[PDB]
Design a protein around this ligand. Structure first.
Ligand SMILES: COc1cc2c(Nc3ccc(Br)cc3F)ncnc2cc1OCC1CCN(C)CC1
Ligand SMILES: COc1cc2c(Nc3ccc(Br)cc3F)ncnc2cc1OCC1CCN(C)CC1
Lengths: 289, 289
């Protein structure tokens, strides 16, 4: 099937991306998600860097399904193609003898959500706008490469040295060069509370559904890692969204910030802003403060 | 889409299966898997039982995707239809106001794998054959109801009072009344090392692929909860199975037991035994010992 073909094609291919397993040393587990497991690691003589370099490594969990393996392969295939100061940087993979291991630049502070939840440490509204803005700039880049990310969320953004946002977790990202949508017949593996209404109901994913997600991400940022639609079970989200409900304005959120959230959550995809207008909106808020 | 329809139809339906949330009290987490989370619980005045009854409750994890929600709904829909001494028994669900909670009879010893791994406690080969036989009897029942379970594995069998096997985790089970196969276009969420070769390569699932899985389950039983294809990365399983390799005979396994494993792992589905012959094979081994 499609996977066996990919596995075979792969297992027979770019020396630019091959790293020798014997120069990688694995360490403590940093995180496990629905698709893969990340460890801290160190790499010897990585891409012309002398000595060891501290890195992070993603790999399959115990008892991986074909689905999770398609996702790892595909994340690897997307990571090879993207370069941006605000997208996670790929160094290579070990693929030969042993499990597939993707090697990326280590992000000092880990996930944005963890970073926010551990805060009050003391962050200003200008910091929060700055964080959102860096992501929007990463997103406008991905939108111009004709990728839909699909999994935008505070847990899938990393925070590197000097509080730099790196967009992460490219396993669910799809190419939309041809038709400007990605459509998935069976049910998605993205959490329901981050999904655009037309992704929920109609399985349509676009840059405008990434915008919806960013809307939710903004709320996570503003609430310092709060839980979206708190107390509300995911199954209730069908009826809640279709009848035109959205999340209340949270505490410590301007009216201008909240209106941006709402414009990202418009029922009609075309009424939402594109990432370039989002970046302009955020620059304008930063400067006014 | 299909899910929004199911959610709406559901959220408007059988009093036989409704349990009042206010008579359920939830307790410690027993387990989390790829699809749901199980807690220990107690239920007051459950289905005509006086006082409290100790039960287990399955629910969605944090940040459930549509996929996991389809799975919970569907597990519930299958559990309503099956009754067998060796299939987990369903008591009801809380579905009204609050998250969906499926309530099942509590299995004293938890998962078969955990049960085996904690053993030497002292189990005989006759115990192991007995365990396999009870499962095969459950499976022959499910095969006659025209279900393919798809997720057969030691981790998805529970051990109740008096060492009784309960087949569990019906989220991936499909109806095959019409065509005797279930075919899935996108990639499956069942671990690769339990999957029949035609499920791996061609996305075809039948009773004969459940047999393949039982083959693997037998190995887990015989090795007392060993890890299938140990040391081998899942991605290597395509080429390893297609070139006709299977797992070696493990220690403490008769030649007759091993030949059954191999007959379950035949390349051609039709050469494998049906669950009735499996049960006969196992009865015959029990009696000869
Ligand atoms: C789950 O946590 C991390 C994931 C990382 C991560 N994840 C990741 C995402 C996609 C891919 Br491909 C590979 C990865 F390693 N990449 C780089 N640096 C990371 C760094 C991470 O955390 C670093 C923190 C640093 C602070 N202490 C409190 C805990 C660990
Ligand atoms: C993950 O562990 C369990 C799962 C159970 C379980 N899981 C389950 C499967 C499908 C559905 Br629907 C609902 C469920 F609760 N059902 C009934 N009893 C269970 C009992 C379980 O474990 C009981 C053990 C008992 C022994 N101690 C060491 C730990 C807990």
């Amino acid at each position: 099937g499609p996977l066996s073909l990919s596995v075979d094609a792969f297992k027979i291919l770019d020396p630019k991306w091959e790293f020798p397993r014997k120069n990688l040393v694995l360490g403590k587990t940093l995180g496990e998600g629905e698709f893969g497991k990340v460890v801290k690691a160190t790499a010897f003589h990585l891409k012309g860097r002398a000595g060891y370099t501290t890195v992070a490594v993603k790999m399959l969990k115990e008892n991986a399904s074909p689905s999770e393996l398609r996702d790892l392969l595909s994340e690897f295939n997307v990571l090879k193609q993207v370069n941006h100061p605000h997208v996670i940087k790929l160094y290579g993979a070990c693929s030969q003898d042993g499990p597939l291991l993707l090697i990326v630049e280590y992000a000092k502070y880990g996930s944005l959500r963890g970073f926010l939840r551990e805060s009050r440490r003391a962050l200003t509204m200008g910091d929060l706008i700055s964080f959102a803005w860096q992501i929007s700039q990463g997103m406008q880049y991905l939108a111009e490469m004709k990728l839909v990310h699909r999994d935008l969320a505070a847990r899938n953004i990393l925070v590197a040295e000097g509080r730099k946002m790196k967009i992460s977790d490219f396993g669910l990202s799809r190419d939309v060069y041809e038709e400007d949508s990605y459509v998935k017949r069976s049910q998605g593996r993205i959490p329901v509370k981050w999904m655009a209404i037309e992704s929920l109901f109609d399985h349509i994913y676009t840059t405008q559904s990434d915008v919806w997600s960013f809307g939710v991400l903004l709320w996570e940022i503003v609430t310092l890692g709060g839980n979206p639609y708190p107390g509300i079970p995911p199954e209730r989200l069908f009826n809640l969204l279709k009848t035109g409900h959205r999340m209340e304005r949270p505490d410590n959120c301007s009216e201008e910030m909240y209106r941006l959230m709402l414009q990202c959550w418009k029922q009609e995809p075309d009424k939402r802003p594109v990432f370039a207008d989002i970046s302009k909106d955020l620059e304008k808020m930063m400067v006014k403060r």
